Amino acid sequence: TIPHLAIDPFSLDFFDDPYPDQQTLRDAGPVVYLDKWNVYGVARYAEVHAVLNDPTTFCSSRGVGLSDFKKEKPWRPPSLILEADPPAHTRPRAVLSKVLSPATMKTIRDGFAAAADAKVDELLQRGCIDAIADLAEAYPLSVFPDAMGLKQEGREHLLPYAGLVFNAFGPPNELRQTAIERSAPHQAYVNEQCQRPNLAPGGFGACIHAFTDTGEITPDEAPLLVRSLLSAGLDATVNGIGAAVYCLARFPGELQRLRSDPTLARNAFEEAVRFESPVQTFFRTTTREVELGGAVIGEGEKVLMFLGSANRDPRRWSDPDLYDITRKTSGHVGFGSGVHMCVGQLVARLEGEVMLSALARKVAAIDIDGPVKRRFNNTLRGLESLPVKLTPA
Ligand code: HEM
Ligand SMILES: CC(C)c1ccc(C(=O)O)cc1
């Protein structure tokens, strides 16, 4: 009753161009079986949203990668928030929601905005840049480690470690096994930086440790939550900002609209998150048989959610393949949905908003003037290199 497909969503051909295969996945039915990896797949908005919003049945505590923690050893101790179910999830979630809350945003906004304005001014001084290395990477590297209160030495481990983490959500293909078998120095750095004495007061990390006396988390849990922020807080925004620049380069009319009204910057970033979905896919594991779109899924089965496909599903979105910075984007699943919905989403939106605002106010044109090169990751979508020429306003 469930169609079986041989599409490999973790192959280089898929990463190079996933949209045709994503349509095939959506149009085959509400639930498919992926013979390549023996998992169920859901690619339509309705089913992705339903799965995300039933975390008891489609749980996270058995891993959100292909591996089932009840069958295999986790490559690292499980995340206490990403890879936990309620009620164990609830208190760490509350701590991270309070660390990365509105008030903390007000405390970091001026530095983030100044850094974004300064970056755009510098890049306009460069004229010809790599929008990845020189912008999408450089800006978050210039503000997020400070906001975490990391020392200067070793911050070079953050992006490699993140790539590993996201590769490790994939199947045991070359990307995953490559990341995990040689990984140890990055793990050593991250774990060391998670300890209270190495995290400067006033930063996100030290605030996590500071919540360890409120009764929400214990001292032994705080390092692992800092590890969550060091895993998730940099690379996702790098590919999101890269996505937004790529969209504005490919849709010059939308750049002109954004320049004319820079207050669209936040929505312009949000629509980029919808349009490219930096985080493409995540798994759940069924804790019971669950009829989903008329299809039966067994106990203990992995279910692959195609977030990007849900964000391009024509059943839900008008002109899904257009980048529209005045689109009503609310309801997209690029940040997830439900109890695990991105707890860092305000940081991501702040970085994206202030950077797109800086471009809107300072840049007249973004023209691609070189080969665009894609970065391959089992979970992340984004570019390796995006050479552009920036014309000043
Ligand atoms: C463009 C930027 C970002 C994107 C697209 C993104 C995407 C996502 C998605 C799809 C989820 C849901 C995972 C799931 O349901 O299993 C998630 C959760 C999470 N994100 Fe982000 N994220 C971004 C930025 C950030 C930042 C900047 C931080 C921290 C500083 C962060 C930290 C987290 C954490 C800790 C979770 C787990 C929350 C939970 O399990 O309750 N993310 N993110
Ligand atoms: C959703 C993604 C950005 C993410 C990755 C790792 C963790 C963690 O280590 O807790 C959380 C979220």
Ligand SMILES: [Cl-]
């Ligand atoms: Cl680790």
